[PDB]
C-alpha cells in the first residue's frame, strides 16, 4: 500500500504547496521535512492569499492541525 | 522539557493571562494544574468593565497566553526537569590527590 507517509517522504526535497483549512493562506515552497505527527517545514516559502502572492516568507513551520491538504507543484 | 512544570513554578506570581476567547485575566497564580488549569486569587477579569473576583479557576485549554513579570528569572526557572532526570538516573587508585 502507498501510504500518505511514504508519498510525503517522496515529496520531500520538492517544490510543494499547502492549503490550510482556512484557505486564507496557501504556502508554496520546498518541502524540507515532516515529522511523525505531520507538522510541515518549508523553505523559500511564498504565501498566496486569495490566490495572489502576499510575499516571500522563507523558512517556515506549519502546524499540522491547520493543514487541509498538501499538493506537489 | 515540559513547560507546564515551568508554570507549576509560578505560584504566588502576578500575571495577566490572555485567553482564546479574548478575555483578559489579571491575578496572582495560586497554583496551575498540569492540565494548565490555573487557579488564581485577587483577580480582576475583563471579558471582551472589570469584574473583581476572589478566586478564579481557568481550564488550561482556554488559555491563549500568560504574560509574566519582567523580573522573573527564566534562566533559573527553565532548567529544572533535566536536573531532576539526572538525579533520577543517579577499585584502588581512588585518590589522585595526596596527603
Amino acid at each position: 500500500p502507498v501510504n500518505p507517509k511514504p508519498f510525503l517522504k517522496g515529496l520531500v526535497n520538492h517544490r510543494v504547496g499547502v492549503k490550510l483549512k482556512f484557505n486564507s493562506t496557501e504556502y508554496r515552497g520546498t518541502l524540507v521535512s515532516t515529522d511523525n505527527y505531520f507538522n510541515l517545514q518549508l523553505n523559500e516559502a511564498e504565501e498566496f492569499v486569495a490566490g495572489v502572492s502576499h510575499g516571500t516568507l522563507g523558512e517556515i513551520f506549519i502546524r499540522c492541525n491547520n493543514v487541509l491538504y498538501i499538493r506537489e507543484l | 522539557m515540559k513547560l507546564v512544570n515551568f508554570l507549576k513554578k509560578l505560584r504566588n506570581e502576578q500575571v495577566t493571562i490572555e485567553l482564546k476567547n479574548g478575555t483578559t485575566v489579571w491575578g496572582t497564580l495560586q497554583s496551575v494544574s498540569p492540565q494548565m488549569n490555573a487557579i488564581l486569587t485577587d483577580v480582576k477579569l475583563t471579558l471582551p468593565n472589570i469584574a473583581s473576583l476572589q478566586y478564579i479557576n481557568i481550564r488550561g485549554n482556554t488559555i491563549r497566553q500568560i504574560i509574566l513579570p519582567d523580573s522573573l528569572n527564566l534562566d533559573s526557572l527553565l532548567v529544572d526537569q533535566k536536573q531532576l532526570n539526572s538525579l533520577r538516573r543517579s577499585a584502588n587508585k581512588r585518590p589522585r590527590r595526596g596527603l
Binding site: - | 485567553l19 488549569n37 473576583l53 476572589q54 478566586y55 478564579i56 479557576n57 481550564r59 482556554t62
Partner: protein, 70 residues
Amino acid sequence: LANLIDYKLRVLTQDGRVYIGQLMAFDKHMNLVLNECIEERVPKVEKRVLGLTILRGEQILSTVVEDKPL
C-alpha cells in the same frame, strides 16, 4: 478544586452562558455535576431553573466562588 466542593459556584460556558450551582463532584475531564443549578444569560433577566445538571469539561471556560454551601 476539592476545596470548592459543595460550594455554590459560577461556571462560564463556551457559548458565554452563565450557569450557577452547587458543585457536588468533578472528574478528570472536568465534567461537573451542579445541584440546584440555574442559568443566567445577559447579566436578573433570562434566568431559568435547570435543576441537577452535568456540564462537560470541554465546554467549561472558568469557575468562580459564588456563595457558601447550603
